[PDB]
């Protein structure tokens, strides 16, 4: 089934109907006027920080377990993995562009819906990153509440509740813990028969929209276009 969409709901409505019971929802009209929506482009990023060095994870396939960390400039990442056709797959490690490019911080705002949490102020972790069309983030479980905001490009997202964990064949990976062994969009049901019967929610997230991913929900993502995302994590 699909993720419900709400237009600028009251803080109390979001808290009681979605945050407390742990139900996913897409909030509209909340981030659509961030300056980032009208400013961020590859050109803008390169004008500010193209010469700055960022950590990049490189691997053979988005769904493989072989990943090594490297260091390259923003310009080099864009040239090798976005402008030209790469020989492998790469993504920005840790998704923390705000460390190397603090100038971007002024172009966003923390959604007020995140201060409904028991941890506020410096306890909100904020990540920003961009990546080429086709970037896949394998199905994995999140230890904190999450807002995912699309600035550029569309993303396909699939969500499973923690109640379905057993059907997702979890294991720990060198990169992160609580990852599914299943290829969400082309599952091998001979090896993973329970996956077929797990219900899920899915949506295509577009620029300006915020997806609320409740704590311990499982989520899978694929970038359908060149993508720029911002995520907020809190307890």
Explain what this protein looks like in three dimensions.
15% of the residues lie in helices and 34% in strands. It contains five helices and 15 strands. It has one domain (1-235): Sandwich (Jelly Rolls). The strands form four sheets. Strands 1-2-13-8-15-6 form a six-stranded mixed sheet, with no helix packed on it. It has a four-stranded antiparallel sheet with strand order 7-14-9-12, with no helix packed on it. Strands 4-3-5 form a three-stranded antiparallel sheet. Keywords: Aminopeptidase, Biological rhythms, Cell cycle, Chromatin regulator, Chromosome, Dioxygenase, Hydrolase, Iron, Metal-binding, Nucleus, Oxidoreductase, Protease, Transcription, Transcription regulation. It is found in: Nucleus; Chromosome. Its EC number is 1.14.11.73, 3.4.-.-.
Concise account of the structure shown:
Helix content is 15%, strand content 34%. With 235 residues, the protein is α+β, with helices and mostly antiparallel strands.
């Amino acid at each position: 089934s699909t993720v419900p969409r709400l237009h600028r709901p009251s803080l109390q409505h979001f808290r009681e109907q979605f945050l407390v019971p742990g139900r996913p929802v897409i909030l509209k009209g909340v981030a659509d006027h961030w300056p980032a929506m009208q400013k961020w482009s590859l050109e803008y990023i390169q004008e500010i920080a193209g010469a700055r060095t960022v950590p990049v994870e490189v691997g053979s396939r988005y769904t493989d377990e072989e990943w090594s960390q490297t260091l390259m400039t923003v310009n080099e990442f864009i040239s090798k993995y976005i402008v030209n056709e790469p020989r492998d797959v790469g993504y920005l490690a840790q998704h923390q562009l705000f460390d190397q490019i603090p100038e971007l911080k002024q172009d966003i705002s923390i959604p007020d819906y995140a201060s409904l949490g028991d941890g506020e102020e410096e306890e909100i972790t904020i990540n920003a990153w961009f990546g080429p069309q086709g970037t896949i983030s394998p199905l994995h479980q999140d230890p904190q509440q999450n807002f995912l905001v699309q600035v550029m490009g569309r993303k396909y997202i699939r969500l499973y509740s923690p109640q379905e964990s057993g059907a997702l064949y979890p294991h720990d990976t060198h990169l992160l813990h609580n990852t599914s062994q299943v290829d969400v969009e082309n599952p091998d049901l001979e090896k993973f028969p329970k996956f077929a019967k797990a219900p899920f929610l899915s949506a295509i997230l577009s620029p300006g929209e915020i997806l609320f991913i409740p704590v311990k929900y499982w989520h899978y993502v694929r970038a359908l276009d060149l993508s720029f995302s911002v995520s907020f994590w809190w307890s």
